[PDB]
């Protein structure tokens with residue numbers, strides 16, 4: 001059985017909190033991802049249940065185990081908690097903190113201000129989401145963990161409404177690399193040295209965070225509109241960068257462009273990103289900027 005090391009500690013399958021299967025009830029499907037389903041469940045403690053298909057390979061089993069180990073070892077408010085696992089019954093379960101707001105990409109697209117919902121979201125709401133995820137990324141950075149796939153689709157919200165907290169929720173790329181296909185690489189979130197040399201550092205996540213920022217302030221658009229993966233690879237390698245999202249304040253766009261510096265040594269670490277986001281939240285001209293109404 002595989003081991004996992006995070007910070008200054010090694011953990012094993014035996015360290016996962018096994019929840020008796022009898023104590024777990026499935027309530028509803030949540031839109032089941034790639035390999036395996038996700039359910040809202042109860043243990044009463046409300047959870048999201050990630051399932052492993054009973055029809056899977058040996059490597060699928062180990063991948064599922066590793067994902068459980070990875071998430072169970074984090075301790076930060078902006079990373080989704082693992083309640084426990086049910087690995088001794090089939091299908092195997094990982095039990096996560098239930099984030100009623102769903103994933104960030106879907107939330108942004110569904111919560112875009114509209115003539116019907118005129119003030120569904122404001123600039124400060126967006127800055128608070130960015131700050132939350134940046135605080136999660138800083139925790140990973142200071143613990144030497146490279147996420148490799150920072151993107152809106154991999155972030156979750158505790159709730160739809162005003163008190164929402166954003167958290168990093170998926171660690172599948174990090175799990176794969178820990179031990180594939182070109183077409184499955186998130187190239188639109190990757191810096192030049194990552195997709196060219198396969199070099200990953202904390203500054204990898206900085207670049208990806210810049211792309212997340214664009215997703216957030218565009219309110220859920222796909223990065224590099226109209227461009228394919230190869231077109232983006234060539235665009236970005238040649239120095240090309242995205243334009244500001246519609247109505248994006250200059251101070252916010254400036255953070256994106258600093259995250260997208262060609263040389264990793266020229267990009268900010270997450271402490272600096274957090275400082276700059278906090279300064280944007282203080283600037284009335286930023287937070288008084290109206291978001292576009294679809």
Ligand SMILES: C[C@@H](Oc1cc(-c2cnn(C3CCNCC3)c2)cnc1N)c1c(Cl)ccc(F)c1Cl
Pocket residue numbers: 030031033038048050080096097098099100101102103153154155156168169170
């Ligand atoms: C594995 C799965 O986990 C969760 C999904 C959800 C979720 C998905 N959809 N919804 C809807 C529930 C009804 N209201 C709208 C959101 C909630 C909540 N908490 C989770 N821990 C998940 C998904 Cl499905 C997508 C992105 C992620 F980063 C993660 Cl980590």
